[PDB]
Design a protein around this ligand. Structure first.
Ligand code: FMN
Ligand code: FMN
Lengths: 359, 359
């Protein structure tokens, strides 16, 4: 079975092609993770997946999506991750972390608490920042503050500081969050970036924030650990061919700049779009990025059906398959998949206290 | 749905009728539990089950089944349980613990390490104790040492000390392990008890160890928390009618002595038997105990099929349904069951970080 072949990138070897993508839990306090996270991530690692990527973790307080997002903007935040990282490794999974800045989508409620921008006079909120003073709209109406050149320097450094802490906390895999309408995605897109300086206008200028952040992170992140990013390569906004072309060009530059793998997504930069949701609908897009940028990719959305994950791999649309929600429903999804695909001794996808009992 | 109605016993209210029965993990060192246990049990509680009973935990070093069994034979062992108990409560589940002494079945290997009595010159082994110097046979050939009256006093006190620690560590539910061929079961059965003193021979004498242990535990265990036990009511050894009669009589005495619920099992006292394994095969037996001793019961074996658990309840064969292995395969089995039985907003069987995403 292809889903259960190992995968080697730099010095890191995943035991199978199952990746658990970053999924926010909204359970942190002041950026600090706790026993929710520890048990959640520990449980997931024991489930069998080859790689577990920790949720979007803010490089700065204002870059949190919500008041419950994790953070890594201080050495104390980083140190909180240490036991969890060690528990993930103990379970045989590779610990990864996505580091992030939510840009104009920041200062919002938890999804079960309105999922919308925090009210003006709610003491939990904060001013958001972005390339340009334009609001997302819809449920996120707040107009962000336009970043100064010093803001841009500071955020870039926040990312470096974040990667450095991530490295020292023991993570073996890092993912830069340049997707889903957040800060990085918003610099690339013309919908959200109307800057007239070095960081807006042309393709080279809109790319600049993302490329510089990568290069600066590369300086602290170990050469021998996969350096990756997530990136919305299209919007389904009626400009897909041209957006894809530019996104693929940028992916080529990422690769040239040391990016080992690209997590391929949709931009979600603006609300007025028409996304053709469906099981593995991202496969064909992911496959085009892989071919044309000649770069390993993962993607997600509906791969919780084990045969679908298997086909994506055999067709070389993906190098790893990211399975999100199915892992929230069943932390042992990898075991479910092994059984479904007929893996020999499938119960030994799990640790011995479970495996012996289930064979 | 009956499986998802709450259940009140003394001052304790379970949020549904799903019980996770004690399942040994064999991951403790010198009786001390660790992060395996913490994450395992924490994960299970968040899964949705109303009650989570911690694995057979030894009241004395020699009463462990294996070198990896948990123990509660010192205040330090008990204190190790404290964080786990608090994590279980935080998740909305009721923390229970089964306290145990493996009798002649003690000093054995982990199931994936031979599952058999430890070799003579293996430094991990120890002498076993029992009512009479007779070996189980088969894979457990060691002849136990015949207990003195002082051994019996000491073990009884170990059980009291165990319940006391369990109480102080915060458990809200206790289960005495008088089943599966272990010490308690071995005092009741004529196959294993050939004593000619006050603790062997007649029904009153064979019952004595179990009844005294209960009464002594009752002295320290809070009146307002369910006091329960697990008990093999038959052997499938060709003596089932008479064994059942005596077992039911004992259950009546348990009830008269303060037992709030009885976990009904098979004795497993000897190997030469013919167990009619099948989905919910214990239902009819459990139901007879319930009727004739007029005592709430749970049982297990194959109730991981949600409709089977539901039927058992509607037919009043059981008051709680114990689901073991299915929870090792999927810690979120209760959520699986809610969906299968059509529970309204089934995803909210899980905590918000999962539930909101899965609705
Ligand atoms: C609760 C929830 C939280 C998520 N948090 C993040 C995140 O922090 N960063 C990110 O890139 N994607 C995040 N995602 C997107 C997922 O990584 C994944 O792409 C998505 O769930 C689709 O894959 P699936 O069908 O397997 O669920 C999140 C998704 C969900 C449902
Ligand atoms: C690994 C494993 C460990 C178990 N440990 C214990 C135990 O410590 N005490 C006990 O009474 N039963 C123990 N049991 C028996 C279970 O509680 C339960 O009765 C059994 O698994 C059958 O139910 P099920 O079909 O839902 O698995 C254990 C069972 C298994 C598979």
């Amino acid at each position: 079975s292809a889903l259960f072949e190992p995968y080697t990138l730099k010095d890191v070897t995943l035991r199978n092609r199952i990746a658990i993508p970053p999924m926010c839990q909204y359970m942190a306090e002041d950026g600090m993770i706790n026993d929710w996270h520890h048990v959640h991530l520990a449980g997931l690692a024991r489930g069998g997946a080859g790689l577990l990527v920790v949720e979007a973790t803010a490089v700065a307080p204002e870059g949190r999506i919500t008041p419950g997002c994790a953070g890594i903007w201080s050495d104390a935040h980083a140190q909180a991750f240490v036991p969890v990282v060690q528990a993930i490794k103990a379970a045989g999974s590779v610990p990864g972390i996505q580091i992030a800045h939510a840009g104009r989508k920041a200062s919002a409620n938890r999804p079960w608490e309105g999922d919308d921008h925090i009210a003006a006079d709610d003491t939990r909120g904060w001013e958001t920042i972005a390339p340009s003073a334009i609001a997302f709209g819809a449920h996120l109406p707040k107009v962000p503050r336009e970043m100064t050149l010093d803001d841009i320097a500071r955020v870039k450094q926040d990312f470096v500081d974040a990667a450095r802490r991530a490295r020292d906390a023991g993570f073996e895999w890092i993912e830069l969050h340049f997707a889903h309408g957040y800060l990085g995605q918003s610099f690339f897109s013309e919908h959200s970036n109307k800057r007239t300086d070095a960081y807006g206008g042309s393709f080279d200028n809109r790319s600049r924030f993302l490329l510089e952040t990568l290069a600066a992170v590369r300086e602290v992140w170990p050469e021998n650990l996969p350096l990756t990013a997530r990136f919305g390569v299209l919007e389904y906004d009626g400009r897909d061919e041209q957006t894809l072309e530019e996104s693929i060009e940028l992916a080529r530059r990422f690769k040239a700049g040391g990016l080992d793998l690209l997590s391929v997504s949709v931009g979600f930069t603006i609300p007025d779009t028409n996304i053709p949701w469906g099981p593995a609908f991202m496969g064909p897009i992911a496959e085009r990025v892989r071919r044309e940028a000649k770069l390993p990719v993962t993607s997600a959305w509906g791969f919780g059906t084990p045969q679908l994950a298997e086909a994506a791999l055999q067709a070389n649309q993906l190098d790893l398959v990211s399975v999100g929600r199915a892992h929230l429903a069943d932390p042992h999804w990898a075991y479910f998949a092994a059984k479904e695909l007929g893996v020999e001794k499938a119960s030994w996808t799990l640790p011995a206290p479970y495996a012996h009992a289930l064979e």
